[PDB]
Ligand binder design. Structure first.
Ligand code: CRS
Ligand code: CRS
Ligand code: CRS
Ligand code: CRS
Ligand code: CRS
Ligand code: CRS
Ligand code: CRS
Ligand code: CL
Ligand code: CL
Ligand code: NA
Ligand code: ZN
Ligand code: ZN
Lengths: 21, 29, 30, 21, 21, 29, 29, 29, 21, 29, 21, 21
């Protein structure tokens, strides 16, 4: 999920968009 | 873990900006 | 409008704190 | 929506809890 | 400036990119 | 004007996220 | 890395307040 | 509108920065 | 109070020090 | 430490919310 | 203080409320 | 840069001012 993926290394806004509804 | 707590606070604000009208679910687990 | 945009930014941070480990659902849809 | 419900007047802790998963 | 352009009305993340250097 | 001050704070955080490694310039002038 | 990323978000907010009308350039590197 | 709430939110973060190790007091009076 | 003094006209960081301990 | 500085920034925003009308004192010592 | 108490393990809202006036 | 200088050890307000335009 978002934590395991984005708190470990920087997520771009494109990568974050994956978590949008 | 507090580090994760702080990371999450920032993730939530980025999602708010990136998702816009679509909105989002923040499911830590 | 900008005011609602600024308000929403704070609402998500309040929900983050209030909800804790449960997580939350944010939708600006009227 | 939540902006309509919580941006004109401040929402209580109970009202914000409505949006928790 | 960015204040006049983005505080009077909302700016998309695409419009904010104009201020990246 | 406090409303502009508050708006500006959010603008800076939006710029930080959108611009990333590129950085940004904030000249309210 | 993420720690630097989090720190940077707080740094730009501080610069916003400290620099005021002077403005600032944010260059992550 | 929730302007006073928003204002206080930013005042608190500015006091935190300005006051350093002395800390501060926030009373919405 | 700080809200009365600082939520209409911007308080300088100098002025804000009045609220430090 | 900077981690402590960062943690504190979030703690005061959480106190601002939880304390509401009661207000709070932030005394890092 | 609150730093020593809440910057390693996450403090609940009740634990934070102990620092309110 | 400012990251290298201020994310390892805390920078005072005066030191941050070093980075204003
Ligand atoms: C914007 C953002 C916040 C926190 C972690 C990330 O990877 C990205
Ligand atoms: C911005 C904000 C925070 C908390 C409650 C509200 O109604 C609004
Ligand atoms: C993201 C953002 C913040 C503040 C104002 C805007 O128009 C846009
Ligand atoms: C406008 C914009 C910038 C960067 C990423 C995005 O998903 C959208
Ligand atoms: C720094 C700051 C925030 C909010 C209101 C003010 O007057 C000053
Ligand atoms: C809400 C919050 C912020 C920072 C540290 C904590 O333990 C709790
Ligand atoms: C105010 C601030 C934020 C982040 C790092 C610093 O050294 C100082
Ligand atoms: Cl605001
Ligand atoms: Cl942080
Ligand atoms: Na200059
Ligand atoms: Zn942070
Ligand atoms: Zn705000």
């Amino acid at each position: 999920g978002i934590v395991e993926q984005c708190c470990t290394s920087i997520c771009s806004l494109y990568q974050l968009e994956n978590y949008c509804n | 873990f507090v580090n994760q707590h702080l990371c999450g606070s920032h993730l939530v604000e980025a999602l708010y900006l990136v998702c816009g009208e679509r909105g989002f679910f923040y499911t830590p687990k």
